[PDB]
Symmetry: C2
């Protein structure tokens, strides 16, 4: 209350798009991301519980990924409270100007996180103005309000399967995140959940790459559950 | 023994700050830039500078302020800081007040200008405090508050292995945008942050505080500013208060 938390009253809570890239063309040389379907199913099932209208889309091209994203922003989120985008794919380690991060489309071409974030800013998507825009990225391999307000990105490149010898048992990250949400999303906010995830991950890999959060929200975000 | 209490106490959910003092705090305050620069005098930074000096002193840090430093001297000050022994400390704070801009980066956006008009990337600054370069802060929170233009765009808004660890970078403005300041009241961001840390540092964690700050600043001026941060922390952070 007192404008300390975003109001998620509406039912459904919002739209959620999951880009699941598994099969890449030969020219790129990017290995098949087998096990990502396990990941996709966990997340689809998850954000569904969080009362979102989840739409999955497999093996998308950089061009097609962008179109799907634009297609989402062209929507009327007017009576909705939040938007969610999840992308599973190989990560691109290009350096950037505004925001870090990129993910490979099936064609081998990258789509920077900065492009993705902006497709959802205030000008491009007035419909979501003042509402929280969440982006979850798992790169396995490879009055007025400010225009960029309410943008929140969780970026993970943590390799590691649930069963360490089996590259097809799924992502230890998604499973850990999914598990933590299942247990605390009912009483803890987004940033609090993600810290539990970040901690769990670090305990699993001392030096290994820890997930980061590019946080530009104005209030806490308590997901709608039960 | 309430919730917040049990929370503050859980070493798994919160960074435990038990040492006295807490650690080092370094404030770099550049106000007078060279002529060749074209950069303006950052009138009002000094009031921001002292507020923070006093603020972090309040939060049990050993504060050291260094003003008007060339890019080279900045790196030097930062190198010496990391070169120290933070073994009996629990946290490290670095504040930078100055002009800034976009810089090509891998993990951390933007850069900050030395008094000489030369740029120092935030990413280079954060990295000076990596686990190898400064094992004395391994696993401990290293905080960075950056008050500098994140870019050139004036936002009108609309009507309504070298990996970061325990790194937390609070940005005054969104990467790519302009950060606003007042000649006699200081920068929106710092004035807001000090005010908020005043009222809540005693009962709220670092991140919670900054949402308040981001929320407050977001309703300001004709031109808009959207504060935010790159959080690579593992736990919540509650400062040691008075």
């Amino acid at each position: 209350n007192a404008d300390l938390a975003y109001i998620l009253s509406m039912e459904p809570c919002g739209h959620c798009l999951i880009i699941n890239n598994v099969n890449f063309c030969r020219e790129s040389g990017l290995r098949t991301r087998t096990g990502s379907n396990i990941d996709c199913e966990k997340l689809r099932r998850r954000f569904s519980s969080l009362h979102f209208m989840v739409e999955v889309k497999g093996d998308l091209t950089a061009k097609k990924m962008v179109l799907a994203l634009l297609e989402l922003a062209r929507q009327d989120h007017g009576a909705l409270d939040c938007c969610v985008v999840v992308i599973l794919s190989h990560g691109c380690q290009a350096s950037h100007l505004q925001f870090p991060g990129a993910v490979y489309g099936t064609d081998g071409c990258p789509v920077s996180v900065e492009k993705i974030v902006n497709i959802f800013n205030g000008t491009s998507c007035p419909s979501l103005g003042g509402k929280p825009k969440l982006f979850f990225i798992q790169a396995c391999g490879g009055s007025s309000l400010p225009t960029p307000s309410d943008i929140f990105v969780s970026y993970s490149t943590f390799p590691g399967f649930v069963s360490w010898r089996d590259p097809k048992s799924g992502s230890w990250y998604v499973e850990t995140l999914d598990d933590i949400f299942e247990q605390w999303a009912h009483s803890e906010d987004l940033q609090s959940l993600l810290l539990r995830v970040a901690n769990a991950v670090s305990v699993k890999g001392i030096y290994k790459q820890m997930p980061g959060c590019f946080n530009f929200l104005r209030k806490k975000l308590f997901f709608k559950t039960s």
